[PDB]
Symmetry: D2
Subunit: 418 residues, 4 copies
């Protein structure tokens, strides 16, 4: 019988088990043998077939019949990446040939998909399922990556508790939403929860963000709320703001120190604490006004939540579509769903010609959806800065003259799209 | 004086009603409008007494709505009071709207609500009042582009998945079959959504039956075939979800058996009272007679009103926010006698005529597309006997053995089901 | 060879069974013990066939139990199979336990499960096998100390509170009365727990009725008086919680009316089939006749099986972890024929015979203490007519007018209810 | 009719609205007029009756009839404290007399109760009667053992759910999470979450024998657990740390905690216990393939909707506060003991050494604490004497058995066993 091998790569997302169960159950009805590689490509990269065998399990009906209820992944995951070295690429092929895998399904994000194709270019069929809580794969605009609905809904619930706490005990929370690729998750939680402000890298006009601009954008929102009798709120910040910051901005971000670096010289953005740094600066400027500021991260607690019904149906249909692609002879394709139809889409169609890697889908800040979400935020627009009565009220809330306020804040209209 | 926006809700509640109310109100307050809300839909506007209406209208202020997007239900309540039947009531509604100087009138409800709003507007000048309605249904039965949901449906489906999950664990921990009856007779979107998400072993919706009228025996045998096939694989437990809409497709003879071989209950006007029907209960009793000897236990369970006012999930909070905004945008752009709908990621007004089915005079009913790939995928992960299964002599031998009958008897009784439901 | 601990579950499932199983297994594994679990309680141990028992026993390993403390249900399932009625079955259980060389035998279940365990032990040498039982019930009807709840009760009550919360929002958003029927016929602990937490406008439990037999009319009138009093304050909606145990206290005449003026159903051996009774449904039908004209709509709703396998709340996660440890502690300390209970924050074994009520021979049943401060406080936040309320003529006039009847007529019909339930 | 005034002080806890609704609904049935002061004592301290009126609301049946479902407090809360100045105390006295408050209910912590009694001690006992309801999510009131403060049950169960997701994520993507449970008073909340979720280790200040904790000891305690699980093939886990560990640390330990810098001063809030431990442990164990990430579980618990246990608890408390007033009680705290809500004079609950209500901490000698410790991964005294176990654990850390015993064995004298 043909052998289907399944692995997960990247960060976990709710519904991984849904894909594994959808593909495996259907594959078992066809008589296929199904196996699962533990921790993604980590052991397939070694090239040692003995080690790989110690880290594969037989995916049986009893194993998968009820994992569609469960967050996380029963075969675990890793970011082990064979595409970096041709030596590692041949190791992955050597172990797959040794195990006589006829069909190879990888469940992961953009990094995982690019890894799959390198193994595929040289019998064996390679298909990948789109996974990310950041929603940054190049799916059709009216289509989400699986795990995003679950992550967004749980993020909304957490932010609701912070909204009740901020009003009950007046305070501002700076929530730092995990994910640096795009702002889909940060904007999603903020819009659903009615958060008073959301900042994503996609809305900054210039290529490089300055630390002062970010501080002042949050400051303007806090003051305008203060002019309307509200000394509390919630502000959501995409962690991706850090990856757009200039060299100078990162220096201030890390405490006016040199940014930490890995052995190769790349900055270590994980050590950055965007929300905590902004909270300290803002307390210095606004504490006297009766404002309290506390940072809060909404990250890893979203990744392995049990899937919501939308992701349960999505991943069941995706797992089926992966098997159907195998039966119909497809290879080097991504299973995507558009207009209620799961279809394979060749890898090449999704590559960005400039990069050679899977294209990254960001928030379209020109869309109607972004404009409606922006309406329900507290912020100063171009028209607001031109309203002399409004500028007077806000400036007074910040205990500064209107001329001082316009000098400091009016330039932000050229920093972010309006 | 600032323009007055009046908002009411009609029909049954759906999660996210407060989302529409807050979305419309908050944007309107930023424009300087005065916003008021009628309690219980048209109930008091039908009286025509302006004294009574004011006692049951409230000022929808920033403080009232700034945080109702978290909450299920509707803070201005709802009713099915329907003025369209009488112009005495319609003119009473007109008299109160004019007294309160309502410039913009937003109704959130089903067709009965939408039709009432347009009828009240037709006997009014277009300059004086502009009328917009937002279509609401938890049944997902509006004619949106395929695989695009009505607001409130996602929340109802996800909560239904959670309830069925607890029943799936309970059926396995203490072997038993649950017949879950999903509320709603319009369509089978909700029953199928819960079933697919929870991995339920069977779902029956009226949309999959080929013939125009369903027979009570066939429904029993379709569930019976699933229970036997599961029993033949060592599983004497499961969960089967039944859309309540099965009752509305049943023949006269089928309804006679459904109500205990009695005459179906009737209202004063003579129309059948299908609400008194207990589909899951009757099927459970009959199946216990046939399968009790095999060690099978069967219990019914309804999943209804606990879904209607659950707090909205993030998808519905965003959905209703865009709808509330889009209605105000429609008012600003001069639209009236229009329905605020979201299609292809865009909230737009849609004239009533485009959505009406001429046969009924009400909005067309979108049912489950049983030819769609989604329905076929859902059917794959169910336990059932297909055309190919009945031709498999080895499989038929095991299932018949589980039912303590010969293979010939089983094929004779059940094989005809392949002509009853699409395959 | 290491000693063998064998575990089974009996009775109905309750949240935290996996918690007890994981507590006992993990600690037992650290001691070097071998742990096995019998599937479906006593079902296969009663056969006496060691081949059948082995086909339905599993090895409880670290990987199997390391994280089941999060999960509702039981990984080894449960059953109500009861060997205690027959010595033939008791000896069969002994034969299979000796064959599997069970040194320690832990049963997790209710009264019947504990009683079966002791009977199996009386004909067994105290040096070969030691038997311990862990008390489980969602009905909270075991005779634990008054300051202690049974495990699973906290989870069932909190989820029950949430479901009723959605019904409270739905009843107010769309004016209606829900008659919620709380599962469990032993006592009213679960119904009163859900009602008080959710602010339900009324709770009726068997424990509050003075007379030994309840009358169907009295139940209808108690709900009728509440609906009218609420109506006298402008509220035509609410939620009323009914312990299913009301049915098991009803007289013969009351049961005849309960089953539709039909003969009550009976099983083959003569036991009335109270499961088939639908208390909330029947009360709704009668109340709609009397109160429909007033604009009152009534709908029943059952809150049953969806609570039994919910994931445990933290209180039950800690409780069942301490119980599983406490069962292992009892085994190590030479205890047998004892039940592991927690009192004043201390887990200790308590001999089964010490917990028996000498008048009956069974474990005493703890019901709601209606004289306690807790019950009086719960009654305060209900809508009802007290003794003094019936004497307040201003109030009685307002309520009677809401009911379309004279004040004298109201007193005639309802005033006697102060002699039906404790005040 | 008599006037009952209610205010909230301190940090919010789930069920605050439950107390407000219990007291208000019962008082309305008695015919009382009920008002609520916004943000605790903040505006009563000014003494301006015009300002206070702008920040008091009429607590009516419609306002409170359904707030028992809701987290937070509808009248908000503050830490404004009039007891510090006799000038502020008059101001509170002047505004309460102006509003003709007969009954005064304060819902808050120890500071809130002390303010209420202080305002009452210099006021005629006939005009005003004062009761306080003790609130804390830290479970540190001196109730009978194994009896909780309201809000603790809700906070613990939601914290369990958060940790569960981290437990799945740590296993799905091998990693260690150092969760820092908010609260410096005690370890009730950290240990409650840890036991319920099956977390592999929990550290509370109460388990350290010496009076001052050393930063090195904390690192090594977490290090030993990571190695012992690693010796059983598991390079992942979750460890819960009570924030109270920092307030027990020595001066030298705090110096290392803040990055070998001078600790900030007016400041334990600025300390990042979980983050600092994460950095040090990565230095020592990163080479072994271990990743460590901190996570704080704080403010998201404070205003969660109450669980059923807290909804009943706060309803019974609100009833008891009204019952105490009717029976003439004043300068008393409404507490529940043996399932009975009754008033207890504030002075009866004070520990003479401090002048504030006594603090109940985790009893590490109790059976409950030992059972929780059993299901943790750690090296006991007996474990260090098991040569086979020490050899495997040391090998997992790529160090000799002698080196492992040299570095870690002394920890059995650092924490109770
Ligand atoms: N930036 C903003 N975002 C959302 N609402 C706002 C904003 N600024 C003012 N509002 C609200 O808009 C309404 C009208 O404000 P105004 O134009 O100042 O009278 C009030 O309800 C304000 O709270
Ligand atoms: N009706 C069904 N729906 C879903 N899975 C099934 C069904 N019938 C059999 N299976 C599974 O399909 C696989 C192959 O079955 P078989 O045809 O007996 O080899 C096994 O894992 C069965 O449990
Ligand atoms: N049976 C009841 N349970 C709870 N609250 C009530 C009840 N009856 C009246 N109330 C409330 O008690 C307050 C005073 O009642 P009354 O003095 O009768 O108007 C009002 O808020 C009523 O809604
Ligand atoms: N520190 C610990 N905490 C909890 N369980 C443990 C610990 N150490 C060992 N175990 C478990 O105890 C059982 C017996 O261990 P061993 O004595 O090493 O065979 C196995 O299930 C281990 O995983
Ligand atoms: O697993 P790590 O290395 O700690 O990184 C977490 C990152 O993974 C994510 O959770 C999602 O990972 P993917 O991009 O692979 O879906 C991001 O939000 C986050 O930046
Ligand atoms: O409110 P009623 O009269 O009891 O009717 C219940 C109906 O409301 C619903 O739950 C939802 O109604 P809507 O489509 O108007 O949202 C239906 O499923 C059901 O038919
Ligand atoms: O398993 P069955 O026969 O459906 O019985 C359901 C009964 O079990 C329970 O859920 C609990 O039963 P136990 O007391 O044995 O735990 C009751 O509430 C209910 O009456
Ligand atoms: O409100 P702050 O100043 O940010 O401090 C939060 C503190 O309040 C609490 O949530 C509890 O407050 P109380 O002690 O008043 O009950 C602690 O857990 C926490 O240390």
């Amino acid at each position: 019988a043909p052998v289907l091998g399944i692995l997960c790569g990247g960060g976990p997302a709710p519904g991984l088990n849904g894909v594994i169960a959808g593909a495996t159950l259907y594959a078992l009805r066809l008589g296929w043998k199904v196996i699962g590689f533990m921790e993604g490509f980590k052991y397939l990269c070694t090239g040692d077939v003995d080690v790989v065998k110690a880290h594969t399990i037989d995916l049986t009906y009893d194993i998968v019949s009820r994992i569609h209820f469960q967050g996380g992944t029963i075969i675990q995951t890793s970011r082990a990446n064979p595409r970096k070295s041709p030596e590692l690429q041949e190791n992955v092929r050597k172990c797959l040939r040794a195990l006589k895998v006829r069909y190879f399904l990888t469940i992961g994000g953009d990094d995982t998909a690019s890894s799959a194709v390198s193994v595929a270019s040289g019998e064996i069929s390679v298909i990948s399922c789109p996974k990310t809580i950041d929603n940054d794969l190049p799916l059709p605009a009216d289509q989400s990556t699986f795990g995003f609905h679950t992550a967004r809904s749980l993020g909304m619930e957490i932010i609701r508790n912070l909204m009740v706490d901020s009003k009950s005990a007046p305070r501002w929370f700076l929530v730092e939403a995990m994910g640096r690729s795009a702002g889909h998750l940060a904007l999603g939680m903020a819009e659903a929860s009615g958060a008073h402000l959301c900042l994503i890298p996609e809305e900054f006009k210039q290529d490089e963000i300055e630390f002062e601009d970010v501080v002042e954008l949050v400051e303007a929102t806090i003051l305008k709320r203060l002019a309307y009798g509200k000394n509390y709120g919630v502000c959501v910040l995409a962690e991706g703001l850090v990856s757009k910051m200039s060299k100078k901005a990162l220096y201030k971000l890390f405490g006016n120190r040199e940014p930490p670096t890995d052995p190769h010289g790349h900055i270590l953005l994980d050590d950055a604490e965007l929300a905590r740094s902004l909270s300290e600066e803002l307390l210095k400027r606004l504490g006297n006004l009766g404002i309290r500021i506390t940072p809060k991260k909404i990250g890893y607690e979203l990744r392995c939540a049990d899937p919501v019904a939308f992701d349960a149906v999505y991943t069941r249909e995706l797992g089926y579509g992966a098997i159907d692609a195998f039966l119909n002879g497809h290879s080097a394709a991504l299973i995507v769903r558009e207009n209620g139809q799961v279809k394979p889409v060749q890898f090449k169609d999704l590559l960005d010609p400039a990069t050679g890697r899977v294209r990254t889908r960001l928030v379209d800040v020109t869309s109607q959806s972004f404009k409606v979400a922006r309406v329900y935020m507290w912020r100063m627009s171009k028209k607001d800065y031109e309203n002399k009565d409004l500028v007077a009220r806000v400036a007074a809330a910040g205990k500064m003259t209107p001329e001082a306020f316009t000098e400091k804040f009016a330039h932000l209209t050229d920093v972010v799209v309006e």
